[PDB]
Design a protein around this ligand. Sequence first.
Ligand SMILES: *C/C=C(C)/C=C/C=C(C)/C=C/C1=C(C)CCCC1(C)C
Ligand SMILES: CCCCCCCC/C=C\CCCCCCCC(=O)O
Ligand SMILES: CCCCCCCC/C=C\CCCCCCCC(=O)O
Ligand SMILES: [Cl-]
Ligand SMILES: [Cl-]
Ligand SMILES: [Cl-]
Ligand SMILES: [Cl-]
Length: 264
Amino acid sequence: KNIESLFDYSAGQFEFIDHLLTMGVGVHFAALIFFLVVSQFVAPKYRIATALSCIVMVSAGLILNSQAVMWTDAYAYVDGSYQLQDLTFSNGYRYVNWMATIPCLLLQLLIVLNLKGKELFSTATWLILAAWGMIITGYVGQLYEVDDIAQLMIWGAVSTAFFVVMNWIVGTKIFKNRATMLGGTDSTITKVFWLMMFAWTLYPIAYLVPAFMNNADGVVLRQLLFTIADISSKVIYGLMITYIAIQQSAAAGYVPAQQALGRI
Ligand SMILES: *C/C=C(C)/C=C/C=C(C)/C=C/C1=C(C)CCCC1(C)C
Ligand SMILES: CCCCCCCC/C=C\CCCCCCCC(=O)O
Ligand SMILES: CCCCCCCC/C=C\CCCCCCCC(=O)O
Ligand SMILES: [Cl-]
Ligand SMILES: [Cl-]
Ligand SMILES: [Cl-]
Ligand SMILES: [Cl-]
């Protein structure tokens, strides 16, 4: 069902994909240690936002690790190239994991936006429903990336509709609650919005790779786009969320935050 199964891979193509996934594991678990240590400098009001980054680091890191082992399990060097064996490789597990990681990325944004109570519960509910609609329709579409490209594009259009509506909720909440943010993070949160628009858009681009580059080099390109998008949407994004959480904690008088920012 996946275009990965259609091709043999040169030693260079196979080893580069292996190193891309392995490097992605190292980056996420290295960042995990950072968010863990820094969490003690976050005020209790925002500490959930930094803990969610730790949850995203292990969740994304485990999928990248699972993809890397599946990649080496599925292919062996036979007659001068890496060829498919018994076990299969698939990108579908990324979609299943997004069902958990995307709500975590959205929740930590709502936390540093100083949303509370019923507006927090209502906004998160609509964001998660829009995200799940996007992921499920996209998962169904990529099942047809070999057998029915036309069906992959129609499911992608439905998924893009959820994507655009989700981004409109995110943008509306950011620019409406930007005024409530402390320590100059009202400026920083606008860059987080544009980082999200850039990084999250890489995923539909990779989703369309079977339509404009259905060959072994397109397989490499898709994993490369996934690596750029994962690092930007989770690691860099989490580093900006954590900075915003620390800066607002210090502005609100949290002494550990003031001492942490003061020592650097
Ligand atoms: C850390 C993982 C993230 C931020 C995943 C983001 C996923 C998306 C933004 C989903 C994108 C899709 C569309 C925009 C329509 C085509 C199918 C979906 C999955 C790829
Ligand atoms: C924040 C951005 C993170 C970027 C992560 C990717 C880092 C490595 C990127 C690729 C460099 C180009 C590698 C050359 C590809 C060789 C083609 C091939 O033989 O398959
Ligand atoms: C084993 C696979 C390769 C492992 C590579 C290890 C290198 C990881 C490098 C950094 C990952 C990002 C985490 C850095 C924490 C924040 C850095 C900062 O505060 O500027
Ligand atoms: Cl607090
Ligand atoms: Cl507080
Ligand atoms: Cl993920
Ligand atoms: Cl073959």
